[PDB]
């Protein structure tokens with residue numbers, strides 16, 4: 001998260017650190033046993049780290065649950081990042097509390113202008129590389145589809161939306177991938193991609209979770 005702020009410990013209870021020996025991607029806890037993340041965050045041997053604030057020191061609220069199974073979206077295209085969403089099932093149900101909570105799936109798609117909370121342990125620097133150990137948050141509006149398309153011409157599918165700022169300076173970044181975009185307490189987006197981080201006219205592109213609630217629900221229903 002570039003230009004964001006320190007969330008505060010466990011203020012984003014659905015925030016997940018996907019750990020494979022290291023935090024490599026974010027995720028969103030959607031129920032006791034399921035994390036959604038970006039499909040381009042897919043790896044084998046994922047441990048799902050819940051209740052994380054500082055991903056580098058054990059602070060007592062962590063729940064480390066390895067991934068029982070990962071389900072990259074069937075139509076995930078790694079080249080265009082279309083359908084950049086993946087389901088991760090925990091080996092065991094998370095112990096849900098005030099700090100390890102699931103995030104609700106969107107009934108409706110959030111509109112442009114809706115302010116969203118993006119969070120992750122990604123690079124905090126637009127230029128260079130500084131990885132925070134504690135969760136960074138960014139309040140960022142969903143941008144219009146036209147502004148998203150004009151920012152990334154020929155690249156924005158109906159399954160993506162842009163959030164952030166066209167003047168840049170505030171954006172999800174590398175390492176925020178798979179992380180939540182929560183608007184009105186609902187997981188509206190997944191940190192998917194962007195041309196760099198916090199560049200002018202290059203907002204973050206996020207998986208439009210509203211389009212996958214069916215697929216997510218049916219997948220949860222049989223896995």
Ligand SMILES: [Ca+2]
Pocket residue numbers: 051052053054055056057058059062
């Ligand atoms: Ca920790």
Ligand SMILES: [Ca+2]
Pocket residue numbers: 173174175176177
């Ligand atoms: Ca990345």
